[PDB]
Amino acid sequence: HTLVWGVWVNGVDQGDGRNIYIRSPPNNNPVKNLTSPDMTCNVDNRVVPKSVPVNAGDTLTFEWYHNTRDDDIIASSHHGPIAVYIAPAASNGQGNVWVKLFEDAYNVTNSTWAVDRLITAHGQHSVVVPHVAPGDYLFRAEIIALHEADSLYSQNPIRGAQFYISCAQITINSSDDSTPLPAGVPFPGAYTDSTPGIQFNIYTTPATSYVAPPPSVWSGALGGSIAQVGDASLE
Ligand SMILES: *[C@@H]1O[C@H](CO)[C@@H](O)[C@H](O)[C@H]1NC(C)=O
Ligand SMILES: [Cu+2]
Numbered sequence: 001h002t003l004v005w006g007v008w009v010n011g012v013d014q015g016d017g018r019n020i021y022i023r024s025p026p027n028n029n030p031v032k033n034l035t036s037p038d039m040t041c042n043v044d045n046r047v048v049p050k051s052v053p054v055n056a057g058d059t060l061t062f063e064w065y066h067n068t069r070d071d072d073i074i075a076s077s078h079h080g081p082i083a084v085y086i087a088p089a090a091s092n093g094q095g096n097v098w099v100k101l102f103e104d105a106y107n108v109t110n111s112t113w114a115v116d117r118l119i120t121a122h123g124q125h126s127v128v129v130p131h132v133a134p135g136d137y138l139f140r141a142e143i144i145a146l147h148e149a150d151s152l153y154s155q156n157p158i159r160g161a162q163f164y165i166s167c168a169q170i171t172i173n174s175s176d177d178s179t180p181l182p183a184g185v186p187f188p189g190a191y192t193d194s195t196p197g198i199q200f201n202i203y204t205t206p207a208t209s210y211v212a213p214p215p216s217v218w219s220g221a222l223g224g225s226i227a228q229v230g231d232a233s234l235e
Pocket of ligand 2: 001002075078
C-alpha cells in the first residue's frame with residue numbers, strides 16, 4: 001500500500017500534489033482488476049486543477065509514501081518492478097497512448113527489486129522528461145507488488161499482482177520535439193492474465209528470471225533512476 005505525495009523537478013520539490021496535480025485515489029489500496037478503468041489512473045481519474053511545468057531534459061521525481069510523508073514508503077513484502085508511462089493529457093489515458101519511459105524490475109548486482117530500492121530512496125524514482133511536443137501530459141507511475149502474484153485476480157480476487165498507479169499532470173513547456181511521442185499501449189488492456197510478469201512466484205522463481213510486463217521502453221526515453229533526489233525533512 002503506497003501513494004504519491006508529489007513530485008520534484010530538477011531536485012526542487014513542487015510541494016504536496018495530492019488532489020492538486022496528482023489524480024490521487026482516496027487511499028493507498030492496490031488496483032488488481034486488469035480489465036477495470038481503474039488501471040488507467042487508479043480509482044478517481046479526473047482532471048485536477050494544477051499541472052506541473054517542466055522542460056524536456058528535466059528530472060521529474062515521483063515521491064511515494066505509505067501513511068505519512070517519508071515514512072516506510074511501502075511494505076518490504078511488496079517486491080516488484082517499477083515502470084513509468086506518458087500519455088497526452090487530451091487522451092484522458094484512453095486508447096493506445098501510454099508510452100513507457102522507464103522500467104526497473106530486479107538489479108542482479110545489488111540483489112534488489114525496484115521496490116526494495118524505492119524504499120531505500122525514501123519513495124523517490126525519476127524519469128528524464130523526453131523531447132516530445134510542448135503540451136499537457138499524464139505521467140503514470142506504476143509499482144507492481146508481486147507478493148501475491150502467483151495467483152490471478154481474475155481467478156482469485158483475494159490475491160493477484162497489485163498495481164499502485166499514480167497519474168501526475170505535467171506540462172512540458174520547452175522542448176524541440178526531436179522525438180515525437182509515438183503511440184502507446186492501453187490501460188486497461190496492455191496487461192492480461194497471460195502477459196509475462198503478471199503472474200509470477202517470487203518465492204520459488206529466481207528474480208533473474210522475472211520478465212516485466214511489456215511494453216519495452218521507448219527508444220526516445222532519456223533514462224531514469226530509483227534514487228533519492230531530495231530530502232523531505234528539509235523541503
Ligand atoms: C473488473 O472490472 C470490470 C470492468 O470494470 C468489471 O466489469 C468487473 O466486474 C470487475 N471484476 C471485479 C471482480 O470487480
Ligand atoms: Cu500493501
